[PDB]
Amino acid sequence: QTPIHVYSEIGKLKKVLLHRPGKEIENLMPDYLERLLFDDIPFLEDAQKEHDAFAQALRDEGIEVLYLETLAAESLVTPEIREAFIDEYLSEANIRGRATKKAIRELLMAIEDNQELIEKTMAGVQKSELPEIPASEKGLTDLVESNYPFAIDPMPNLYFTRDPFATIGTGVSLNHMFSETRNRETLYGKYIFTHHPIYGGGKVPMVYDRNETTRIEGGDELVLSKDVLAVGISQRTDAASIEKLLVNIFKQNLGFKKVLAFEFANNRKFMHLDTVFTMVDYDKFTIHPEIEGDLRVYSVTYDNEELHIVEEKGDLAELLAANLGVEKVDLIRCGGDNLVAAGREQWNDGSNTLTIAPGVVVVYNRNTITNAILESKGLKLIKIHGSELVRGRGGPRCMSMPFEREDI
Amino acid sequence: QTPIHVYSEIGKLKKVLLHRPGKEIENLMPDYLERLLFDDIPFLEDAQKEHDAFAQALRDEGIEVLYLETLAAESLVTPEIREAFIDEYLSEANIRGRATKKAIRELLMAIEDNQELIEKTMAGVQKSELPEIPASEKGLTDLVESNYPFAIDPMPNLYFTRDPFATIGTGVSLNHMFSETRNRETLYGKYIFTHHPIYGGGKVPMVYDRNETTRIEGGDELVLSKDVLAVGISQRTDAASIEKLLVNIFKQNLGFKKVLAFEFANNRKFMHLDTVFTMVDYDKFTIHPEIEGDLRVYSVTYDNEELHIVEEKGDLAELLAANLGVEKVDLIRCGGDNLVAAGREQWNDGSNTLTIAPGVVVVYNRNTITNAILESKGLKLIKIHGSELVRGRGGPRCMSMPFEREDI
């Protein structure tokens, strides 16, 4: 056995990693929304009830729900590792002024409970929380006073555990995010996969590093089968990251023979591959209709220790069927045939469906048309309320990171 | 003795005008959240449950709940008035192509139920809903094909019945909206106040008309008392419309002696007077903190049929107390002492509270700090769920238009 075991997107989910929204959602302000990747300001209490209901809906299906804050807290195994974490967090926090960085270090060092400490680093720090620094103690950047209310920004997207790191076979892809707001989130994965008693100490092989120059995000990484991976060349994932990931996979002999690289890097509208394409059964996929036209797929293999590329110019459904070993693949249209319904539901992550078993999917109640089509195809739905959670522009698959899945 | 009787913002509410969200909310698409006026795409079914719960919470307080779509349907008293409505709606619908205008006229003429017809005009028309026009029947704009999915754009702000027309005394201010697209919404008020058996036939005097040149919006119209009106000079209401309004009031002898004009036209952040200032009791007002500094108040009277303006340079609370005939006025700040909460709650319409009786207010459950301040001041709160409705960036006062309030 191994702590990580993910060889599909549809295998019966046994362990999943989530993040319960904390004060990072409360520290959202209207003027700073576009950058912190938020569409609206959620109501924390209702967002927490919705996220608890989602985690409970997973537990009701026999899934072990793991929390990012808990795993990160369990990684600060020594006072030295706890101090190393505080200092690494502060160096990446983009603090303006030496005296402000010093005051925050004192504040964090005073938090006795490890999970309480982790949660505070996730929430950020308001300037109002800090004592008044006397002029004599002030440095140059301390003297430049601004109306900006945060000393350390929150990381509100943390409840979207899909992107900072993705599980591949027995390994993890510790990602280098597009936005430097979201690349701060990869600090929790770093401490878990190096110092956690179960997930650290080299027990989990790394197929990507956060230190790496080129960008990659978990939403582009799809584990279709034990032999095939799907990865999108998008606005958030550089093509160079995909080759470095492939070379590392065949290096750590994970067992994946081929990689289907989905080129749509020119399509700014759709951030990740999973926002327009997910696997819901052995021979079924939810797809966004618009992406069919400007899509280029490549078969990337690692033979004679060198990488070989073949552009697959044929039909997508036929290509997926040949690669999965099934007779025919059904590409189910998000939002049906109606353009308006498709646009509306795509925006609400209608194509980003979490599959907890073959043909068993977790969906938002608001995606009525897509849900009705999935049901008509013989799929089983677990509908959840996501009115507050969808404000972060992500669905159930975005809010989750499988740690263990039954083999197919 | 008159169908409209509104001489305060706090008098016991007896009749209110609402609009239940319809298919206009379903006809929202991500790429055009710009050429319309929305922050997010709501889930219509949940939006409708939330509104119904809001309307029922009002009925439970002995308020008669009137609907815009019903009143507009009841105004199509003759086949001639029904046809005049269809043709006026089409002339303002900005239809691209003569043949498309003709096809939509046939479509609407086929809807036999008047409310079903009204609701369809509110929803707009998708191009997919229209039959294929043969090339021979097509004109030039018909031939220029675009990817744009609507033949007639929805009116998604219709559930915010506060702005297109405001009730003043026994009269109505049928407004001219700042944007010509939002101004399509004032067509329903026009048919109501001219042809409705109760509200038409000149039974409701007009203190403003939609065919007026300068712009004014309901959110900038406050009926403080039977003698005093508060009107805002904002980004949405031209100062010239206020003079036109005042002259029409004093002419139609509506009884209002003074108008307190609030200058903040330079403040680009706050759209109307009501988003930063509302009356919640005889001597209490909910206010946004930021607005006190850059605020200029003017006393506008019409003595000897010639407008007289006096700038009020004194304290706002003292000024409001002298004008209302109370000893002292309490200006309750939205979102309290914490900057983050104040920003968050102002955004969720925390300063714009519906008062259904003196000291009895209807609020969103999400505005925790404002609600706690109101409660601590001895006010009775009726809390509603507005997770879907607040996506339109408006609160309970924004979604309501009083038709009758008891005298103070």
A199: tokens are 């997930």
Residues A287, A397 share a domain: yes
Q: Dihedral of CA B159/B163/B165/B166: which sign?
A: positive
State the method.
X-ray
CATH number for A132: 1.10.3930.10
Same domain, B55 and B75: no
- Site from A271, A347, A389 to mutate, B interface, most B CB atoms within 10 angstroms: A347
Structure tokens of B35?
């050429």
**Chain-chain contact of A41 with B340 (C-beta, under 8 angstroms):** no
| Residue B264 and residue B296 in one domain | yes
Q: Resolution in Å, one decimal, please.
A: 2.5
Q: Which of A398, A400, A401, A405 is catalytic?
A: A398
Same domain assignment for residues A350 and A313: yes
Q: For residue A253, give both structure tokens.
A: 């002999």
Structural domain count of chain A: 2
Last residue of a domain, one of B96, B122, B154: B154
Same domain membership, residue A58 and residue A189? yes
- CA A195, A201, A206, A211 torsion-angle sign: positive
Q: Give the length of chain B.
A: 408
Distance CA B252, CA A139 (A): 66
Q: Are residues B309 and B374 in the same domain?
A: yes
On whether both B102 and B189 belong to a single domain, the answer is no
Asked if B303 contacts B267 with a C-beta cutoff of 8 angstroms, the reply is no
Output the domain CATH number for residue B217.
Answer: 3.75.10.10
Nearest by Cα to A168 from A199, A196, A204, A193: A204
How far is Cα B68 from Cα B189, in angstroms, rounded to an integer?
8
Look at B387 and A43 and tell me if their CB atoms are within 8 Å.
Answer: yes
Distance CA B408, CA B404 (A): 13
Residue numbers of the domain that contains B127: 68-154
In A123-225, beta strands by DSSP E: 125-126, 150-152, 165-168, 171-174, 206-208, 221-223
Given B120, B136, B154, the domain boundary residue is B154
Nearest to B388 by CA among A21, A366, A20: A366
Name the domain boundary from B130, B154, B178. B154
Contacts 24+ apart (CB under 8 A), A319-328: A319/A260, A320/A224, A320/A285, A321/A283, A323/A224, A323/A225, A323/A228, A323/A258, A323/A260, A324/A224, A324/A225, A324/A228, A324/A282, A324/A283, A326/A282, A326/A283, A327/A283, A328/A283
Same domain, A371 and A260: yes
Residue B384 contacts by C-beta under 8 Å, 6 or more apart in sequence? B50, B53, B54, B57, B362, B363, B364, B365, B396
Residues A215 and A166 in one domain: yes
Tell me which DSSP letter residue A395 carries: -
Shortest Cα distance, chain B CAs vs residue A158, angstroms: 19
Instruction: Please give the residue of chain B at the shortest CA–CA distance from A46.
Output: B366
Q: How far apart are CA A50 and CA B255, in angstroms?
A: 52
| Set of chain B residues whose Cβ sits within 8 Å of the Cβ of A348 | 41, 43
Is residue A55 located within the same domain as residue A105? no
B58 membership: H or E segment, kind and range: helix B44-59
B338 contacts on A by Cβ (under 8 Å): 128
| Shared domain check, A229 and A180 | yes
A398 is catalytic: yes
Closest CA to B159 of B125, B192, B122: B122
Match 């999917």 to its residue by tokens. Answer: A361
Alpha-carbon distance values, B232 to A141, A355, B315, B328 (Å): 41, 53, 18, 23
**Binary contact (B39, A39; C-beta < 8 A):** yes
Residues A276 and A323 in one domain: yes
